[PDB]
Amino acid sequence: PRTRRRAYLWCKEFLPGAWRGLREDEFHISVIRGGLSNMLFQCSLPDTTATLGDEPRKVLLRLYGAMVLESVMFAILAERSLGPKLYGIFPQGRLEQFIPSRRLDTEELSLPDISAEIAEKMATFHGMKMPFNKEPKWLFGTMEKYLKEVLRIKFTEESRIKKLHKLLSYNLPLELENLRSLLESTPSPVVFCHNDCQEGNILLLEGRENSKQKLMLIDFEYSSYNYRGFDIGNHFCEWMYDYSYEKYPFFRANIRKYPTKKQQLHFISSYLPAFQNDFENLSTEEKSIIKEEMLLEVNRFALASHFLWGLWSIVQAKISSIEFGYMDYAQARFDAYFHQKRKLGV
Amino acid sequence: QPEPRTRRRAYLWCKEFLPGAWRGLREDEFHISVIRGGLSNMLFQCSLPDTTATLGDEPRKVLLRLYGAIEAMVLESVMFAILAERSLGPKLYGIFPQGRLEQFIPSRRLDTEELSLPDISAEIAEKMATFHGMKMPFNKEPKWLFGTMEKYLKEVLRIKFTEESRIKKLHKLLSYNLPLELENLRSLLESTPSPVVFCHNDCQEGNILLLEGRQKLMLIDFEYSSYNYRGFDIGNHFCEWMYDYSYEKYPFFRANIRKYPTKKQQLHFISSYLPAFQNDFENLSTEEKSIIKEEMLLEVNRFALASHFLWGLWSIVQAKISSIEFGYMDYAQARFDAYFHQKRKLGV
Ligand SMILES: C[N+](C)(C)CCOP(=O)(O)O
Ligand SMILES: C[N+](C)(C)CCOP(=O)(O)O
DSSP states (O other): OOSOTHHHHHHHHHSOGGGTTOOGGGOEEEEOOOOSSSEEEEEEOOTTOOOOSSOOSEEEEEEOOOOHHHHHHHHHHHHTTSSOOEEEEETTEEEEEOOSEEEOOGGGTTSHHHHHHHHHHHHHHHTOOOSSOOSOOHHHHHHHHHHHHHHHOOOSSHHHHHHHHHHHTTOHHHHHHHHHHHHHTSOOOEEEOXOOOOGGGEEEESSOOOOOOOEEEOOOSSOOEEEHHHHHHHHHHGGGEESOOOSTTSOEEOGGGSOOHHHHHHHHHHHHHHHOTTSTTSOHHHHHHHHHHHHHHHHHHHHHHHHHHHHHHHHHHHHOOSOSOHHHHHHHHHHHHHHHHHHHTO | OOOOSTTHHHHHHHHHHOOGGGTTOOGGGOEEEEEOOOSSSEEEEEEOOTTOOOOSSSOSEEEEEEOOOOOHHHHHHHHHHHHHHHTSSOOEEEEETTEEEEEOOSEEEOOGGGGGSHHHHHHHHHHHHHHHTOOOSSOOSOOHHHHHHHHHHHHHTTOOOSSSHHHHHHHHHHTTOHHHHHHHHHHHHHTSOOOEEEEOSOOOGGGEEEETTOOOEEEOOOTTOEEEEHHHHHHHHHHGGGEETTOOSTTSOEEOGGGSOOHHHHHHHHHHHHHHHOSSGGGSOHHHHHHHHHHHHHHHHHHHHHHHHHHHHHHHHHHHHOOSSSOHHHHHHHHHHHHHHHHHHTTO
């Protein structure tokens, strides 16, 4: 809803039935709040217009923030029934199936059955073969890419000049190399990750609101081959952040909402059997050795989540159209980065 | 056989995208050779050494396809990916901006002469029919045909040649008044009914594999695919009976105008296409089946004119921007020769 009637034309030419030759004035489009990278819109036929065929009365329009890998990835997942159906695809975005559901709330990530299912969902997604680069260059390649931008950017507002200067006073480039030493010496398999498994990217499916099999993972924009440790660590960090806050800065950070060791162990107890066929056949002692090594792994890679999304947020404070306290969020990520580095002593 | 000194790019792509033995392969133990047939893209076969054994799942040989010169880069990739997921094409192993790594399928391309074999011809038709009935996440408006012709023409009227013999050849082609002849062509096709379906757009013998140890065939290379008039896909395929791209001396193609399918052979093709595209078909009355076939005969032979015009222009564009060894200017004259020839046969 912004005088961009490209959404109407996209729907008219890409969708079958009633959508073909649907008059401009009879087109219903509204924004869907939530995402911090991409725009999302609902497109619908008027309730009175109801045609016979396979075609949907309601679709989604997603526009990319600021290419091929996300396109091809969405198609493949659509083809495997692992995501929504794909209706249209263009360089600027896509038209996808609207799925009756809602996004999870932050507080729901901690619920045992939810947590268990996300774990299993993530385990099976990690076991997929994808036509992408198998080298784990995403993690530090991305952080170097943002860091270069961060070190270039300047502001005009005195409040923001001060916020950026505090952030840079951590000597971010050295800090990045300390992280690189820590992480490159932490064993964690490269698997297809995714890199953003957040409440807002997990759908509670209506009807299936009973039984495992309640959820769907969506939004594979940041996906790539990566260290598994990152994918789980990033998820754990997401217990601390709630993006539904209504007032500025449009998020809340709660460090004491990070999962306990017992909560992490319950998650990885569902991850492992689903990721490794012969896990449940190991002895209790060998299982616990694996579990303890994994807790060290993911909590170290958790630091890369703070560092990466902290850097991302600073960059977004320049280039993003979305209203969100990006600077305040970057600082929140780095607060958590140093706090957690402290407790680990590494 | 042996690729150009930058076999190195091929090596680096294989090493990075392919799992198992490929990860630990040295540049000195990398096997690769060029495959010569295509006129858009370049193609290579890459292999592990025979002495090298796999660490399980991974392919021992793959195909590297590199895009040629001629938004559509997205559609091309998504299309290959979707077909691989459906088992309507080779598996996708790697995708990157300049091309892809794909399953090497044990097989060979068809020869020009094989297109007329009744069994080969029937299957091509059944195959094309089932592709035509697919739903794809692309634009459903038939803008491809004339959008593409207006595109190649805009460039054709802009290009200028350094060499003198190719200055004469272009001048001759331009003296047909192509901007005006395109509007002639547009008018004729506008009043020709033809179902909009997902079209392959380049169904030649070189994009059809005869599968080893053999339902004998597989349609491949969906680069030009889009929503388009059904008549063009079939019309284009009929034109392909006349053209042989395996000639080994200049201009590296042979045109035989006498090899266009007869009405008998055209009828045999569409008699296989139809029952595979229309659920009702074989139940229909004899009278009604003839009407549909006879209307289809007119439909496809009018759209065959778009095949000659479209590829004639394409071939001129390729004469300034393509790096493949081919007589692009000679090819363009042959297609426009065939266009007026066909325009006469139709009395249009
Ligand atoms: C929220 N985040 C900073 C972890 C990821 C980017 O936002 P989104 O694209 O997942 O909304
Ligand atoms: C052969 N053609 C001229 C009809 C189309 C372009 O060549 P190719 O891309 O199918 O090899």
